[PDB]
Fold Type II secretion system protein D.
Amino acid sequence: DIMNAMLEVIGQLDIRRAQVLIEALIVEMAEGDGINLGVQWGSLESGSVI
Amino acid sequence: KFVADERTNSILISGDPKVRERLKRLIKQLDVEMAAKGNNRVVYLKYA
């Protein structure tokens, strides 16, 4: 009897395993900008600067 | 009176051919084997 029980357990734990295909998708979009403008001044004879 | 062997798993009898009639009746009476009860069960968890 115990044999016929454990064969019915083994029968149901022996099943095939499905297999998943995991496909990640990573999207990284960067963008940048900048505008740096300015006027400087100087006189080195008598040192005076902007 | 009564005997059996579980080498053979067999009722032996000591007594009447009336004991032979009724105790072939009880030879037959409890010979039956209970149907499987699914005493144990393997359950497939869906989530947990």
